[PDB]
Amino acid sequence: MLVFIDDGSTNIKLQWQESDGTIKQHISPNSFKREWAVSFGDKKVFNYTLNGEQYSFDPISPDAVVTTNIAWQYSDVNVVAVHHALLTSGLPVSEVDIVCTLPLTEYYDRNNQPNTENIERKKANFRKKITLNGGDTFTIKDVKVMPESIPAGYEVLQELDELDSLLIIDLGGTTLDISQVMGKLSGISKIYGDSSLGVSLVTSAVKDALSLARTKGSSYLADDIIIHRKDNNYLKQRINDENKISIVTEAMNEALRKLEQRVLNTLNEFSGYTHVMVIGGGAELICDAVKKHTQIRDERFFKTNNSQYDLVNGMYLIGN
């Protein structure tokens, strides 16, 4: 079995196809604490041991450590999150081959050439042995590494003439990376990674406007508000009450406005692209501004409505 994994610092996305020809997409959060969970009842808990350290999946983990999540890519927790993702995917415990991802500025050096040291370091990380109390864990065999962004725009790129170039904008949970690639992957024109902004900006704004606990527990509430930000009817029924709908809609627009300014400002660093694609979980939050501020016809502007999965799907369509 081969599993494609876009192990982001917010959510791990998985995609694979089963014998009955069904293609499955799974998503599992990166929310673990460095200690085992205690269950005196039947509630299932996942306690792991990796590199001698203890870890457990935590549904209410503090949104703390809003610092360097780049190092997370080579961390123990990353290994745990991926294994946990495999365990809750539905697939049967077994040996598996995987293809994981490395952010653009980690996969490539400043010369836009493969950073072999980082790629190997990523493969080595998944060799760290893991254990699960009261259960079996999958066995990761072969590890392949693909860079982010490019796999998502691969389909479109096969269609582009060598002279054309696709601009890929990826808004993630805590990062906003933009790259430009010549048609048929004739070369990488430019890469601009930014780990100072992400969707969490709006999520954090929402958690503030409603004064919600700064943990994973309230992440779903925040996301539902952002996702349905344009449907008052939904908000009316969702927001506790007191109709803070005014303040939250006010907080969201602030953050969204900031995401747009950043993207537009960075966009000014690129030129000559003939096609544009917006991917990542935050795609819907900036697609309008991007399309408005680019000179590209509808025919050449790409965006799906399953944006958080665009990358892992692209990886799949290539390596499966």
Ligand X SMILES: Nc1nc2c(ncn2[C@@H]2O[C@H](COP(=O)(O)OP(=O)(O)NP(=O)(O)O)[C@@H](O)[C@H]2O)c(=O)[nH]1
Interface positions with a second copy (CB under 8 A): 20-23, 27, 29, 59, 216-218, 220-221, 224, 231, 233-234, 236-238, 288, 291-292, 297-298, 304-306
- Is 25 buried (19+), middle (13-18) or exposed (0-12) by CB count in 10 A? middle
Which tokens go with 179? 């790259």
x-marked contacts with Mg ion along 96-135 as a string, rule CB under 5 A: -----x----------------------------------
Burial letters 73-83, b for 16+ CB under 10 A, else e: bebbbbbbbbb
Q: Which of 8, 147, 151, 153 binds Mg ion (CB under 5 A)?
A: 8
CA gap 101, 117 in Å, rounded: 14
Q: Which does 238 bind (CB under 5 to 8 A by kind): ligand X, a second copy, Mg ion, none?
A: a second copy
Binding part of the chain for Mg ion, among 8-16, 30-38, 124-132, 252-260 by CB under 5 A, reads: 8-16
Binding site for ligand X (CB under 6 A): 8-11, 172-175, 198-199, 223, 226-227, 280-282, 284-285, 307-308
Q: Measured between alpha carbons, how far is residue 6 from residues 78, 138, 165, 179, 210 in Å?
A: 11, 17, 24, 17, 31
Q: Which does 101 bind (CB under 5 to 8 A by kind): ligand X, Mg ion, a second copy, none?
A: Mg ion
CA gap 317, 155 in Å, rounded: 9
Q: Which does 217 bind (CB under 5 to 8 A by kind): ligand X, a second copy, Mg ion, none?
A: a second copy
Told to check if 198 binds Mg ion by CB under 5 A, we report no
Contact 156, 149 (CB under 8 A): no
Q: Which does 10 bind (CB under 5 to 8 A by kind): a second copy, Mg ion, ligand X, none?
A: ligand X
DSSP type of residue 91 = P
